[PDB]
Symmetry: C3
Subunit: 288 residues, 3 copies
């Protein structure tokens, strides 16, 4: 009976240990796959788009840096797809709110550059367009162009103090575009909204230009004369929203772990059922 | 005996904490379920298509009269012609003037032209226009891109059909006095109801024109225009929803079950613990 | 009255099976959802930062023109114009061989290459000046093609083949004469499903008019002006992602199977309670 009991105990032990080892192996396999999945989801968040419609935009900032030109004319034509042309080279007709501030360089910290800051169109439904014309007496230059830079608000500019920072931040963060010289450039602007971590919101300006030639037949072509025309208009009454989010949920992973534990227990319950069946076999052997 | 005082409160403290963790968990899952329902995600795919589906291009010359049509079968270097001579109406042109829907004031005129086909064969349409000099500066022509030119021909009430397209579409402007290269790409978006919409995108590029060959005195304008298909990879946009329609019910039910079954395990384990504690008290009694 | 309880037990057995009908409906919904998720892989965008970019490769087809300038500034934007037409100042790592176009299988193409900016803090802007005699086509246009690495071109053999695959991968942008063209270059990185990474180039032109009154080129000899300044020291990292893992879904279904079995345990208990109610009725 010694070796019969030895073989019975060995069979019981090997069956129980094999069941427990398969259980542990699948448990480690599942926990490994879950932890790599969690790391993968932590590594790469996923982005989301959305479109909202607003009735009217705030007043945006447009910081023109004319080299030596003077503001010949500016208007606020609304619905005026065909602006009333007139004789070029004639000053006046300035119905715009401006504020001429000159500040210093961030790179060399010496350039005492200026900025003829002008407001932008307010309502997209009104589809108002701002028409600006600049003339500069010709000086020896390979090409002539005036840059323009956009920032969020013409009104928060007013209430803000220490405006040197208020221009430094915009130029350091954003980049600059140069509307062409000798042509009329039609520029459509659309504000994009980007969600940033900690709940911070960022406004980034993007635009697509469209150049159209200008005929100087209405003026005598002479040295010392060059005209620029630039117009800004809100592209569409839609705001693009970018929200970067993380799909994985830690709690969801925990729920999956519990299901394996319950599965493991049910596996252990079936192993105990096998053990009690073998105990019944041993009872049959003893009663034999 | 102080042992009863020590022990007869944990049996309900475990209940209290298990309901607390359960309600916190269900709050978490309902909150993030609502969050995922509120903010969906978008997925982008590319489709390679051998079929053109010529869209058709709108044109509003206004005062200019087209001088030429050319349908370059496959040639990126057009032959030189005489700038100013008329003829060669080779485009599939259909003329339908219409009234303004948006201002309800002007008698608009349109020249619908069938779009280029065979992107792999790279057929490009070439049109040129001559306009007598006018007082107005910045002479330019407007154009619009609309799909399904043939379906437009089958369609009726075309005035309404053209009127809805202009409002929906951006209608970017086409330059004057400047040959322009326009490459248009087809993008397709999946709407909420399951239908799909079609939108156009273009990357313009302007090239200068040598008018030195021409001998102008009045100031006549001779702007050209060229359309071409870009990479035929049509982009499909489908904003899918997060995959938890019925799953999170399964997760919440499973976390309910684990605590329910561990409640009975807690009861039996504390019964065994109180039995062995009674044995310990008996041993040192 | 116990016969009605037996019939109620039979009805409990039948609700044991309408429940698994509900369960098979649910798992069919789950497998349809999985088949949907293996169809629409989501996309991910990452914005990494590079302190000093790789040397890019720019191919130009000057036709019958002649390169006249390779001025690599340091931080100056104001270019001192010496003479519109003078040759020299070729301080650029240029190189050229004649290539044969495979598309027509007969066209021979000549392309000279340029080292490129390669740095963003320096914001190098290679400056090229081209002069060409009067032509008949009446549209002076020069085609410029961009690829990832200039240095990979020189060391690798099969330079003809190296041209014969950097042909349709990019769109072969073209710039025009008579105008200074400001091309701002940026690259995006796309991760292949096999683990490869594909480089892509994106550009945003901005043309500026030119004044020819400084030389009076009455004949028609056109000029060209191209810069290649980098836009930002950022790289768009595009990686696709797969939403669903089969093992992760498997668990939810397994949990449901356990719950239904547990529910049956309780449900048989409920039938015993109906039997317990019947005994009180018998009293």
């Amino acid at each position: 009976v010694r070796f019969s009991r030895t073989c019975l105990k060995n069979f019981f032990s090997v069956l129980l240990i094999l069941v427990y080892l398969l259980l542990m192996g699948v448990a480690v396999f599942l926990v490994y796959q879950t932890i790599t999945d969690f790391r993968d989801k932590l590594k790469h968040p996923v982005m989301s788009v959305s479109y909202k419609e607003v009735n009217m935009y705030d007043a945006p900032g447009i910081a023109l840096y004319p080299g030596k030109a003077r503001l010949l004319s500016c208007e606020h034509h609304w619905y005026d797809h065909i602006p009333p042309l007139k004789d070029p080279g004639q000053p006046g007709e300035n119905t715009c709110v401006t504020q001429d501030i000159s500040y210093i360089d961030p790179y060399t910290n010496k350039t005492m550059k200026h900025a003829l800051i002008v407001q932008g169109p307010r309502d997209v439904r009104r589809r108002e367009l701002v028409f600006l014309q600049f003339h500069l007496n010709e000086t020896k230059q390979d090409f002539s162009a005036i840059d323009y830079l956009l920032f969020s608000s013409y009104e928060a500019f007013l209430k803000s103090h220490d405006q040197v920072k208020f221009m430094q931040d915009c130029e350091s963060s954003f980049s600059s575009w140069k509307f062409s010289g000798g042509f009329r450039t039609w520029v459509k602007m659309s504000l994009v909204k980007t969600k940033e971590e900690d709940g911070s919101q960022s406004v980034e300006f993007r635009q697509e230009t469209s150049v159209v030639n200008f005929i100087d037949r209405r003026e005598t072509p002479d040295k010392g004369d060059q005209l620029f025309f630039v117009v800004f208009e809100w592209k569409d009454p839609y705001i693009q929203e970018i929200q970067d989010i993380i799909t994985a949920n830690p709690w969801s992973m925990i729920a999956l772990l519990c299901s394996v534990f319950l599965v493991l227990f049910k596996a252990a319950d079936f192993a105990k059922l096998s053990v009690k069946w073998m105990i019944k076999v041993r009872r049959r052997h003893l009663k034999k």
